[PDB]
Amino acid sequence: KVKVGIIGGSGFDDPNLFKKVGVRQVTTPFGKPSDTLVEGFVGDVACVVLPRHGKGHLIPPSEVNYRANVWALKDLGCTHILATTACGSLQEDLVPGDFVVLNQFMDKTWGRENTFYGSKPDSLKGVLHMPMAEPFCERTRQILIQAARNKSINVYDKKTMDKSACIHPCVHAEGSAVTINGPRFSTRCESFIHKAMGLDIVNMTLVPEVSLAREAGLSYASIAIVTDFDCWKSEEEHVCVDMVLEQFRKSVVHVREILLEAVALIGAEDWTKTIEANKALVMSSRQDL
Amino acid sequence: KVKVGIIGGSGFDDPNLFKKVGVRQVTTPFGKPSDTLVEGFVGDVACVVLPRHGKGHLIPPSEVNYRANVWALKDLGCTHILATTACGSLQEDLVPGDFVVLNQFMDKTWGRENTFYGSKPDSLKGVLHMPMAEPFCERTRQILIQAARNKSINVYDKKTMDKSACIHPCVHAEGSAVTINGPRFSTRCESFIHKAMGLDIVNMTLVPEVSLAREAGLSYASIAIVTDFDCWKSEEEHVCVDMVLEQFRKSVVHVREILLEAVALIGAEDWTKTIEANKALVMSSRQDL
Amino acid sequence: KVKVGIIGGSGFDDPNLFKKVGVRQVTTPFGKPSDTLVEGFVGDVACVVLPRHGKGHLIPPSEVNYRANVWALKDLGCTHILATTACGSLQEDLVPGDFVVLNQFMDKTWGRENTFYGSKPDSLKGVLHMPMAEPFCERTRQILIQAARNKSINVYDKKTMDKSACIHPCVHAEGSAVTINGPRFSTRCESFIHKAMGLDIVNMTLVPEVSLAREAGLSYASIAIVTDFDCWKSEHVCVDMVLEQFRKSVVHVREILLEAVALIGAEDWTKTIEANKALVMSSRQDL
């Protein structure tokens, strides 16, 4: 009944989550996806993994074909999409090695194809105005957090827990990302303003991925990996990048376990009313109709 | 002498403002307008109307040819442009069913052709840097406000009236819009930040329409219709939607009355000096000259 | 060992900084630069100048080919780029006639080609994520500031000096620019928000020029001229006073630039140039 797609970011350019059956090349009305897809199973649940940047990480965030990636997963029968993203921290209690199950974002991207619908021949005919106040699938968000608990990963909820209960590495139960266009990182001025706005992390790939998943009627949740992009500040930059990469490798191992546990938890529940509600929200958001 | 163009937004896809005298299928140096232009009279005042999204509302906000629409109206001899827009509220005193005669905006659009001038073969030769501190025609703004008073619609002016005088439904005598690119609505995170910046309403179509009107030497004023896009929060979304659409239908009836009265009020005054000043501001903003 | 490129903004459409020894009518793998590049010398220091908007100021900010301008200077062997920009003030102590040696910015541009690298067939292959926390070359920033001191122009550093040391016209030793896409100026609503964010000046041309210079392994520094774009509040006499002051500001910036080229050539830059190139290599994520 359910099928989980996985969009792997940095650290997942060469997917190896499960015992691979075969790789699959697909075409899409909006172009080719970033790479071939790896098809397999976790339990009795079909799973398919797609590297966001391609196998060698040769595609930058602004040039990723998010429409083709999301539609390819849709056409393969996916009902859910779990995604990863490496990010920088903007707040004290989010430190390298932590994870964030995001629930909000502020969009600073531009020049990317961010909708399936329009009046151009390269899009589906129609005008679609999708509500995005809470842009993720809340059921799928809580499954990622429960998967972390099941794998004995600390979970921190700043609305219900003291800052001393912040035990790293932890999964932050909530968080907002500012998605910048890249490829450059932010200036200190820009980072200060983003921090003053209360944003938790900065990344480059969440939007329009999260928006297109909802346009496709798919349940989408993202888990962000906090890393460190400031090794240029240390005196021994070569040692710093080695230490940050080693911690990032350990973070990828944790996220791999969370993703595998989440796929099983998704396949254990019924999603009939949620999938139907995902499809109806698309229909009701059609202004031309 | 004076000739009033009207750009009808949502709810005005079939404007139906006056008896059609001429129907003009127009071509501009910047492409085709959203639809055929309908020419006629309101009283003794010549008037031209076009629907921003075309018949059937097939054109989303980001793909409207704002240059062709404004240029076509200018080409037919318009001296003024009155425009409508359906918007969502960001502040407590702006309630669905109110109207706003906008006087300010913050631009968050991208990827739209926003100027007639440039160095490319498809633009007018020159470099134009237009002042936009107060981006509307103030005379024409006050015409819309007087038109509302003449049609016995409450007018609330926060500059001179207390919040106790805010009697709904009312026309707000001033207001600022954040224009997002669409087609999606804002996240809660984005709406919270726009509200913290003091913006009154959110829409998707004001920019670059207001900018191009001033580039063309035209007097531009907008009247926003506050409606409700958050029907998903409701227990029975089917019931709220019908209530919101019924309120929106009443709103377009009153906006039609305001537009027709505003056209008559424009025609009752001399605009020689204002038109002359509109044209002179374009010439004085040419940096290449 | 050094060669200084100069990108002249408004007021420098016909630069004329030195005797023209030669001209270079060139194009790049990313298109045509804004105009012919003019080669010469300041003392014994090689210099190249190009007008950002081309002669006659026919190219608006959003259509300037920043990639081609930076690449053409790099192609001629430039090690540094000094750039000028005319800007408006967002804060009370930045008054028309002042200058700013920028050290920060907030980017509100869009639709401009802003990187040499990517997966497109016509770009340099690879994924380049350059750090930009402090986006200018700091050594070159201090050269511009020292050049102003050497030309008898007041310098104001709000980190160490009370506001009583802000004697106009002055070079502000640091400052942030919000770069808007243009061509229109900001609404009062937008200006109020930019001011509340603490930004010092507003312009239209700094980004992506500063980003691409770092991608190219070049030392880049910008000197802004504060002028006044709000004479519509008055009329033609207001404009004439603002234009005369801007003319004087252009003369001052000309003296600053010529002294800066001499100060750059008087020092060794082997280490800094090698660091510029090593930062490009270490920012390649595909490697």
Residue numbers in the entry:
A (entry chain A), B (entry chain B): 3 to 291
C (entry chain C): 3 to 236, 239 to 291
What does the article say, verbatim?
Because the S. mansoni genome does not codify an adenosine phosphorylase, one alternative to fulfilling this activity is 5´-deoxy-5´-methylthioadenosine phosphorylase (E.C. 2.4.2.28) (MTAP). This enzyme catalyzes the reversible phosphorolysis of 5´-deoxy-5´-methylthioadenosine (MTA) to free adenine and 5´-deoxy-5´-methythioribose-1-phosphate (MTR1P). The observed overall fold of SmMTAP is similar to that of members from NP-1 family of low-molecular weight purine nucleoside phosphorylases (PNP), which consist of a central β-sheet distorted barrel surrounded by α-helices, as observed in other MTAPs from human and bacteria. Furthermore, a comparison of the KM levels reveals that S. mansoni MTAP can use adenosine with the same efficiency as MTA, which is one fundamental difference between S. mansoni and its host and reveals a potential target for schistosomiasis drug development.
The mutant N87T also does not present any large structural differences in comparison to the wt SmMTAP structures; the consequence of this mutation is that the capacity to form a H-bond with phosphate/sulphate in PBS is restored. An interesting consequence of the N87T mutation is the presence of two water molecules near the atoms OD1 and ND2 of T87 mutant occupying approximately the same position of N87 side chain. The bulkier group of N87 prevents the binding of water molecules at these sites. A disulphide bond between residues C233 and C242 was observed in the APO structures of S12T, N87T and S12T/N87T mutants. SmMTAP structures displaying this SS bond also have the gate loop locked in open form. In general, residues 229–242, which comprise the catalytic residue D230 and the gate loop, are disordered in subunits without ligands. Comparing the BBS between bound and unbound structures reveals a large movement involving residues 230–232 (usually residues 233–241 are absent in the APO structures), and residue T229 presents a different side chain rotamer.
